[PDB]
A = this chain, B = another copy of it.
Amino acid sequence: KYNFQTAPNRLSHHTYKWKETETDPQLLPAWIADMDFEVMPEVKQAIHDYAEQLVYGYTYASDELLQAVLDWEKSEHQYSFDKEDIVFVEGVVPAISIAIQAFTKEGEAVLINSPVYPPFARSVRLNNRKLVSNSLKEENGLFQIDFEQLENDIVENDVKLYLLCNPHNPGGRVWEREVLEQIGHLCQKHHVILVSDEIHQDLTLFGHEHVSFNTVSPDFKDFALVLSSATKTFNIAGTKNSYAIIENPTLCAQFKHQQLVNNHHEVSSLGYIATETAYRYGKPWLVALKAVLEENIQFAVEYFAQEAPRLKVMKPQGTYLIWLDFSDYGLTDDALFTLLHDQAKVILNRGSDYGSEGELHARLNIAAPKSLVEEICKRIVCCLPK
């Protein structure tokens, strides 16, 4: 029914992902987090229906779009809230910057769990806030929080804001309810505001269940907000819409005020349309996708185990992204990436972008047809040094 077998040709679309391939046709990309899968058919139709409006002027977020978000959140994540708790933002990374600027002052400390999505550290640093990197443990193939050190990091730096990634990118760690509750209790104790980046929430796999942060405790809304989107779930990043759910009146007003100060309050018409459409029609597409992602991940894990046993592979609990550790090889980061790029002809995300814990790591995107994922894994193991 849905096509997860053939990858639409993207070379002519000015994509980030395929940019290098436009000049060097032998490069295969598997880095930036979008998919080489056709998007659900109803979004395509919604774009055609937009063209047929004939006039492309100024629009606002409808009651139907607000209801679609409420309905998705309740039905998928058991998170019940009011339409007025929703704030639309053209992207989640924009929302992170707005939250930093609203909820902290210059020089105050913002904590992250490293290694993590590079715009977290970037946005803190560029905003002239103190970055506190709470280093994740790695135990038995999974990231885990050191709660003793996390508390030390909060107290020793007077942390004002915690940027949480859940599911955590990279690694694809789907935090248990009990882990989130311990995090929230630290924030309550130490008077920390928390932003939960839950953009990957719909992509938990292998029986792992997303727990949205404010569902953990009814008091968590007093200090925490949730960011999510339809874009990673449904491969519609180019449509530019996302949302913050901010139930606390003071937090909500502060975020919205800062958004307006920055004139960052407006969203494109297709931004609105694609999100409403994706949530209304996307459940069966997403079910079918998850089966394909699980198969690609299982394939990659087994292939790597057989062809490059020295390569340490973190199996995701969610997301379509695999965190690869080349630390057992006699390499530098520069030699690793020259090797992958110039010899293997594959483009992966550089692990050192995610923090010092990502040195000698790469991140591999498996959201593409299995035939492409097979080729990418073959390239990755081809030229690894003895």
Question: Which A residues contact B (CB, under 8 angstroms)?
Answer: 8, 10, 13-17, 19, 32, 34-39, 43-45, 47-48, 50-62, 90-91, 93-94, 96-98, 101, 119, 123, 126-127, 235-240, 257, 260-264, 266-272, 274
Contact = CB atoms under 8 A, between A and B. Distances in A.
Contact of A263 (B14, B58, B97, B257): B97
Nearest to A278: B56
Nearest to A53: B13
Contacts of A54: 8, 38-39, 44
Contact of A62 (B14, B48, B240, B268): B14
A37 B19 contact: no
A239 B264 contact: no
Nearest to A32: B58
Query: Which of A51, A56, A127, A269 has the most chain B CB atoms closer than 10 A to its own CB?
Result: A56
A272 B14 contact: yes
Contacts of A17: 57-58
Contacts of A127: 261
Given A14-B272, A47-B51, A270-B270, A237 B60 contact: no
A315 B240 CA distance: 39
B271 A268 contact: yes
Contact of A266 (B90, B236, B261, B269): B90
B16 A34 contact: no
Query: What are the 4 tightest A-B residue pairs by CB atom distance, in nearest-first order?
Result: A34-B57, A238-B269, A47-B51, A97-B263
Contacts of A267: 240
B94 A264 contact: yes
Given A56-B237, A58-B15, A262 B97 contact: yes
A16 B48 contact: no
Contacts of A19: 60
Contacts of A237: 56-58
Contacts of A101: 262
A79 to B, nearest CB: 25
Nearest to A97: B263
Contacts of A94: 262-264, 266
A47 B126 CA distance: 35
Nearest to A94: B263
18 contacts: A8-B53, A8-B55, A15-B57, A37-B55, A43-B56, A47-B50, A48-B48, A56-B238, A58-B237, A90-B268, A91-B263, A94-B266, A97-B261, A97-B264, A98-B262, A126-B260, A127-B261, A240-B240
A59 B13 contact: yes
A59 B97 contact: no
A123 B263 CA distance: 8
Contacts of A123: 263
Contacts of A266: 90-91, 93-94, 240
Contact of A235 (B45, B56, B126, B235): B56
A55 B38 contact: yes
B10 A57 contact: yes
B16 A60 contact: yes
Contacts of A61: 14
A331 B27 CA distance: 71
A52 B12 CA distance: 12
A264 B270 CA distance: 18
A163 to B, nearest CB: 13
